[PDB]
């Protein structure tokens, strides 16, 4: 069993990964291995971490995914880690409370 | 000149030309087999046959694979490779240390041994102060009876 | 290895056919023609090479319309109503 490419492209680049596959017909057949992307992340300046409620959908299928598959139902849900939201909810509240005090 | 059918037989026998067998004695009936469908009739009909792949036995090897188990063919003259190529030091260290880290981890789980001594030995296991499992197996026994006395 | 062994080193094309002249003179990397000077509107034409001016001047082709308008000037553009 030696295999050859089936899609018109023939280079071992990262976007052209292939999977060897024994078939029902007992052929051994290369198949395109999907170009998996890492999923949604909290922003790079906030340490760039993978989000919890969100799937690493390729945008090729992200359009067809349910909205909540790419988010949590929290404010900034598809954008920020829960701690990052809570950092703000505190920082919004506490900073305004000092400003409200600087009028006195 | 049935070179076409042999092209065809090889394709529909799903093999190489080397294996397909066109019957020498009936070249003419083979000779008028223009279509793959004609040749498939010749394949069931026995004029064309696929030969078995030429044998490549492992019996010499399996008999050798017995003797190697019994330590035959092992010594200095039979070794091309450096002792490290022939069996890596990193391979032994991993196995040695995965084994130690696991046994320390098995006792800590059943608490045959204190969560204290586990560091005491997890960290000595990493400095190969323990040659084997049963070296650590007895050290855990003797690092522990020292405690049993008090 | 500047000879036959470096002839194997040469693999590309400098020129593909031109959209105008049809010459294999379209430098694909500098998208222009060495012959017609295409895409420049005015076609390449040098007096130091009249063997080439002659080679591609009018009458070199069908003169597809020019035959029609020549016939007409000869006939005073005579016309049916």
């Amino acid at each position: 069993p030696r295999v050859q490419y089936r899609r018109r492209m023939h280079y071992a680049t990262r976007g052209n990964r292939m999977k060897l596959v024994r078939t029902p017909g007992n052929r051994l057949v290369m198949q395109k291995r999907v170009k998996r992307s890492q999923g949604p992340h909290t922003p790079w300046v906030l340490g760039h971490k993978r989000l919890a409620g969100t799937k690493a959908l390729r945008h090729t299928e992200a359009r067809l995914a349910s909205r909540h598959e790419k988010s949590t139902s929290r404010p900034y849900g598809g954008v920020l880690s829960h701690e990052q939201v809570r950092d703000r909810i505190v920082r919004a509240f506490l900073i305004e409370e000092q400003r409200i005090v600087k009028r006195a | 000149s049935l070179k076409l059918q042999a092209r065809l037989a090889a394709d529909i026998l799903r093999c190489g030309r080397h294996r397909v067998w066109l019957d020498p004695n009936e070249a003419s009936e083979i000779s008028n087999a223009n279509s793959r469908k004609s040749v498939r009739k010749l394949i069931k009909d026995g004029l064309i046959i696929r030969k078995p792949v030429k044998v490549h036995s492992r019996s010499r090897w399996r008999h050798m694979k017995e003797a190697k188990s019994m330590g035959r063919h092992e010594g200095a003259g039979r070794r091309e490779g450096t002792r490290e190529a022939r069996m890596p030091s990193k391979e032994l260290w991993m196995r040695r240390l995965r084994i130690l880290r696991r046994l320390l981890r098995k006792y800590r789980e059943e608490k045959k041994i204190d969560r204290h001594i586990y560091r005491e030995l997890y960290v000595k296991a990493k400095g190969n102060v323990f040659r084997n499992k049963r070296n650590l197996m007895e050290h855990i026994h003797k690092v522990k009876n020292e405690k049993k006395k008090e | 290895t500047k000879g036959t062994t470096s002839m194997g080193q040469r693999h590309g094309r400098t020129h593909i056919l031109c959209r105008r002249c049809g010459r294999n003179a379209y430098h694909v990397q500098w998208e222009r023609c060495a012959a017609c000077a295409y895409p420049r509107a005015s076609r390449r034409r040098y007096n130091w090479s009249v063997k080439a001016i002659k080679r591609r001047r009018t009458g070199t082709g069908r003169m597809r319309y020019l035959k029609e308008v020549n016939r007409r000037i000869k006939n005073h553009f005579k016309t049916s109503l």
């Binding site: 018109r8 | - | 094309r13 593909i16 056919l17 294999n24």
Partner: protein, 50 residues
């Protein structure tokens, strides 16, 4: 390889059906001059580099 602009395929297509022996009956005309095709091409010789 596979790649061809159709414009190149039309040209090799052009030269391909142009690559034919002269019709037999053309040689039998009065005042005929042609015998062999003087513009026969062979892929292994003249190259239509397109």
């Amino acid at each position: 390889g596979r790649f061809k602009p159709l414009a190149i395929k039309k040209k090799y297509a052009k030269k391909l059906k142009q690559n034919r022996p002269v019709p037999y009956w053309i040689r039998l005309r009065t005042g005929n001059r042609i015998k062999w095709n003087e513009k026969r091409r062979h892929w292994r010789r003249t190259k239509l580099h397109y």
